[model samples]
Target: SRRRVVITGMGMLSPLGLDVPSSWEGILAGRSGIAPIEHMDLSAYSTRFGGSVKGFNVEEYLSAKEARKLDLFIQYGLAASFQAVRDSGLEVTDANRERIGVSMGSGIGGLTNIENNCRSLFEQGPRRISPFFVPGSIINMVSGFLSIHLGLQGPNYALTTAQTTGTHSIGMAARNIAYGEADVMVAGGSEMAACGLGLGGFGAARALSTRNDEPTRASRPWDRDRDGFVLSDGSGALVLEELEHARARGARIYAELVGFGMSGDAFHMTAPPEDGAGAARCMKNALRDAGLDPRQVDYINAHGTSTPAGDIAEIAAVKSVFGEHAHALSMSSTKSMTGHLLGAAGAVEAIFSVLALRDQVAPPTINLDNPDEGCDLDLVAHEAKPRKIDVALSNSFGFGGTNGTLVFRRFA
Candidate 1:
């Protein structure tokens, strides 16, 4: 039998807020974090709005000298991981150092660094390129630097699965511990793609919102006026430990990560399969993995990116998975408030789902004034609702037709 896995701690640094509590409060209060792109010059691009983390001081999280060695994504990852480790209350002593691991993921790694280096090379030639270029641009360094920082000496790794990276990382990390590869795992996702390249690339592809005039309402998921997702950057981390190990240590278990499911569309690189068949299968598989019936799930954190087709397809998937119970399940896209965090989205949404289970307060999906006719469900629009939730699911689907779902059950 597979060993059980439980979430002991969680940390988040997103456009919504810097920490879990503050972010959750913002979401629950129906606040939208998407705003005008103040951190970068979007004058050349069509989309002038995005969900950018405000008031984040990388220097506050790391020494100036140390911060210089890493990219912004890695800095966010390290900062969030620091908070997660501190919250986990687990002492990483010499005896158990080798039994701890890290599995973090980033969808678009170091785009900012890549863009900067390319500009430097073009302007000042190759010789002027910084020696730290290679280390700073690689995605795996997010996990590499994290392991080194925490002295976690086992199974350190990273996954770059577009938007599904975060959920996939958490599930895989749980499997490692369940298989006895490690006693504990630091797992989550991060991204720092709010720069020119990050925004311009997506904008060029017409996959980002072009509503420069209305920044706050740009990420209007399920709204008929929705155009595309508002690009955002941030990081979120969770500490997963063996259930028995946590119990032995008398650790507070927030929730049990009971099931995970993944799938591929294989039909398109950026578009989801028509009718959301692949996504529905993914959710069904997760429910089966958790030994759960559709009726048992109290809430769903939707992968609604506010895009036209994506929102409709996701709603279709939910309807297929839950049948009649789909109407009863309270669903919300916290992305409605936080915008899309891309790789970091899954981890942050998972954290929100766990919080929902713990507090029985379902976060609201803001900016749902005119819901698309196709997306007809109980979306818990624009207002936090009081509901008794014991089990919840978080969904994330990426650009490469990759889909991931994680199921969490409340712990006593």
Candidate 2:
């Protein structure tokens, strides 16, 4: 028999809040975290608002000396990981240290740092670039830095699949625990890319919402007035442990990560097919992996990025995968409040899914005043819905047509 993986601890820093409790509170209340981007001059950009993490102090996690060398994304990742590890109460002794690992990633890691350094390279000559540029901005440094800081000697790596990065990282980390490669894996993602280049690049690609006049209503997933996703910054981390290992430690089990699935659209680089065949297949694969019928699923944390095309495609995929049960399922997009966290979206959404299973309440999708055509699935619109959620699935689709689905079941 294979080992089962269970979520033992969770942590996050988002536009909604700096920690999981505050974030969940904000989500349950249907509060909007999207606002005007204030860090830089966004007056020239088409999309001026996003979900920016606020009031974060890097010195709280790292010393001022050490924090200065790392990028904001890395700092965010480390802080989330620290919170997760502390929440799990997993004391890393010499004997158990080797069994601990980390699998953290980011979609566009350290975009602000990269932009600053690139500007320095052009303006102040190549020598002006800091020595920490590569280490600070790279995607894998999250895992690398955490291992060194936490003394985790197990499997350490990161994935980069655009928005799917977090989901893939968590899924693979669970596999590591199940395969006996590690007993516990700290897994998730972090992103802080609301910089000049970040905004300009997404704006150039026409992938962001332009509701500058109404910041809170910008990320209106499934709504008739929706334009596109709002770029955001945040980090989420989950501690995945072998079921027995968690039980041995008397850890508070959050939920069982029963299944994970991945697929590729192979249709467009940034857009899903209108029919959502690939998305459907991804959901089906997750259900099959979980060995559960589609009817058993009670809720879904949709990757509803508020885009015109993406929202419809996800709905189509849900209808295809769940069939009649689609009508019975409660699905909602938390991005309506938090905006799109890019690389951290999956991990943050996954955390929200687990919390939903724990509380038996589906979070609301704010700004869904009028549902668009074919967006008729029970979206838990406007307000949180209390329900008997036994199984919840979280979906994440990235730019390269990559899709990932994670199935979480209430701890029995």
Candidate 3:
């Protein structure tokens, strides 16, 4: 018999707020978290804004000495994991510790530390590089550190698939549980790539909005006048457990992760297929995996990054997959409010999607004043809409033409 997987707990360190309740509140209120650059100086840069997570206190989750040994990405991941574990109230006893695992990754790990090390290597000599640099900045260290912290001994997985990394991480973690590799898993992704090079590289690629004057309005997905995505820094984590294990322990089941699918375009390096065939297939595959029809889906958390071509391409894909039902289900782009958290976007959005199912209200696609031609569906624009969401889906499309989708259902 196949094992069932459910989301028992969730945590997030996002541009909107530090924790899940606060962030979900901001999402439901249709508030924007995008703001001008605060960490790095963008004096001569075209894009001067991003979604930066402020008021993050390392002492809340880690000691000062331990925090110094990690990069911002790892710190963010661990902080989120701590919150998730605490929320789940899953104590790591000696008997049950080995049955747990972890999966966390970053799209661009430790960009700030990497850039700083390069500066040291160039000007201050090779010896000046910090000893903790390599151990602290690598993508897999988040999982490594998390396992050590939680005494998890089952699977320790890490992924890096650009913006889709978080979605893939959660999907893979659910698989781990389904295959009997572990009973509980801490899964998600984190990112802290708002440094100079992070913003500069995207700006150079023309993938970032340069509306420095209006930071809040910069990330307007599906809007006709939108420019590009706004880079954000944050992390999202979820505690996934086998259904029987959670039930035995009297755990609160938030939602059940039903389906997951991933595909590659092999078409372009930075651009999606204009017809959106790849994305459509990914969503269709996810529904197939979930054993569901398109009509069963109630809402979609779109990967609408506000790019001119990508936004329209996703619209075409939704129409292609859902057909007439595309207009029936409400879809929204939360990126319009939280900006794009790169690898962390999918997991954070997944948490929000589950919250929508729990609260019976679909979060809105804020800043969507003008709908594109192909975007004729109910967008739930500007304000949160009260609707009964039974099964919700979230989409994530990344730079290498990689796409991932996840389907979640209200736990019965």
Candidate 4:
């Protein structure tokens, strides 16, 4: 018999709010979190605005001495992980410690730290680089530090696949539990790439929106007037436990993670094909994994990053996958509000998906003034929609032709 995996707890730190409840509230209210870049020199940059994690206090989650060594990415990851662990009510007793693990990653780990270290090495000296620099900024440090903090001795690792990092992390973590590798896994992704080079690189690639004057309205997914994505920073984590383990412990299961699927475009480095064949295949694979028909899906937390081409591609993919039923199911792009969290986008959106199932309301896609040519589906635009979302799917497609999807069913 195959083991089942369920999401027992969830947490996030996004541009909208510092934690999951507050962030979800902002999402449901159709509020935007995009804002102008600050604390950095943007005079020479084309895109001067982004979504940054606001008003985060590290001391609330970590000791001052410990927080001093880590980069912002790791700090966000730890804070979200702590929130998840506490939410799960799964105490790590010596008996259960070895059955717990962590899996987290970042799309662009410590870009700010890397830039800072290079400046120090060039101007000051090679020896001026902080000793904790490497350990603090690496992608695997989140899992490493969390395991040490909670004394988890089971499988621990991190995966990085650009924007799909969080989806892969949580999906693969669910697989870990399914295969009996561990009973519980803290899984997700974190990112803090709204820094000097982070913004400049994406801006140079012409991938960021240029709506500098209207930061709140910049990330308008599926809008005809939209230009590009809004780069953002944050982290999202989920406590995934085996179904029997959760039931035995009387855990509150938010949703059952029934399907996880992955694919590669084998096409472009940064652009998905116009036909959206790869994304369609990705969603179909997830449905097959869950033994579900296309009609069983109720809603989708779309990847819709507000890019000119990507938005249309996803629309085409959904139409192909769902056919006439495509217009029947509601879908929305929360990125219009939270902006793109890079590596953390998928997990944060996954949390929103589970909450949607729990609360029976589909979060809205803000700023969709004019839907693109192919975007005729029900977008749940401008306001949250009260709907029956029994089985919700979340889509995440990243650079380098990577794609991932997760299907979650409402727990009865």
lDDT of 2 by residue, 1-412 (tens): 5799999899899999999999999999999998897888888899988998899988778999989989898999999999999999889999999999999999989888889999999999999999999998899999999999989999999988898888888988998988899999999999998888888999999988899999999989999999899988889999999998899979999999999999999999998899989999999999999999999999999999999999999999999998899999999999999998888999999999999999999999999999999898999999999999999999999988999999999886
Question: How far off is residue 401 in model 3, in Å?
Answer: 1.5
Question: Which ranges of candidate 4 are over 4 A from the true structure?
Answer: none
Superposed model 3: Cα runs more than 4 Å off:
none
TM-scores for every predicted model: 0.98, 0.99, 0.99, 0.99
What digit string (tens of lDDT, one per residue) describes model 3 on residues 305-373?
999989998999999998999988989999989999999999899999899899999899999899878
For model 2, the stretches where C-alpha displacement exceeds 4 angstroms are none
- In candidate 3, how many Å is residue 22 off? 0.4
Question: In order, what lDDT does every prediction score?
Answer: 0.89, 0.93, 0.91, 0.93
Tens digits of per-residue lDDT, candidate 1, 223-244, equal: 9999999888889999999999
TM-score for candidate 3, please give it: 0.99
Give the worst 10-residue stretch by lDDT in candidate 1: 53-62
Error of 4 at 104 (Å): 0.8
Query: Which of 1 and 4 is ahead in TM-score?
Result: 4
lDDT of 1: 0.89
The alpha-carbon RMSD values of the candidates against the true structure, listed in the order shown, are 1.0, 0.7, 0.9, 0.8
